Design a protein around this ligand. Sequence first.
Ligand SMILES: CS(=O)(=O)Nc1cccc(-c2cnc(N)c(C(=O)NCC3CCNCC3)n2)c1
Length: 263
Amino acid sequence: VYLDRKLLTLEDKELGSGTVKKGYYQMVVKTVAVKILPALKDELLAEANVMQQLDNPYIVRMIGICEAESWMLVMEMAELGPLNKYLQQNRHVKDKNIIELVHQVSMGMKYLEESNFVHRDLAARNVLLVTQHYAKISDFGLSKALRADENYYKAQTHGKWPVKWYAPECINYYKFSSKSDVWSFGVLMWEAFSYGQKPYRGMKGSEVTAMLEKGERMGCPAGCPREMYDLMNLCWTYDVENRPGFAAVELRLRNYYYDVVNE
Ligand SMILES: CS(=O)(=O)Nc1cccc(-c2cnc(N)c(C(=O)NCC3CCNCC3)n2)c1
């Protein structure tokens, strides 16, 4: 869990910015991504505590923690980076390939759901690419392990929230469940088939709430197959009780993907 600073080699060229830096952990050497930093230290440990309990091919794995110059969270490297930026820079990625990637995210989220963890920041910017055909879910900074007796996590304060990705019950009742993550997943799908474009462009969070309250939803991205747009809309079911879970979502995507592969 706690890593050996001597065995960590950091690179000067930062990946982005709190900063994330590329590095090497001497096991072979494993290429790693390193998130470098009271409350912000508490958040990192909480985040590490979450990742420590998760074991799945479609989630970013934690290597461990290291306290030196700053507190560091050492994770496996997804070399191609965020999905949204990737698709912005690679506009000829084929539809079949987009379905493959979004399905992989649904498999990761089906596992998280089975594990009774809520992600709470599921957006294209937090899906990272190991290859053009291999996506992982990253960024567990808002994630919560659900209590054994509850189906949701109740937030207290409302603090720095990606509103355009959040379900009505999140905005109106501060309640976060795996079905709320499904809502987020629909927005992620829209982003992916929009080649990394921002959802609800030009709109205030409040105007998004108003739009959704009117039953209005974002339109089908150009070239997006009807069946994936239907699935998007199913994820954006207003009533949480009638919104599908990730078992249902993953299976839809799985079948469609195989049947796209057949053609
Ligand atoms: C987006 S970036 O970091 O500025 N650029 C950036 C560019 C290229 C690669 C990565 C990368 C590779 N592997 C990783 N395991 C991570 C990783 O865990 N990053 C943490 C961020 C995830 C996304 N939201 C913010 C936190 N990152 C990050």
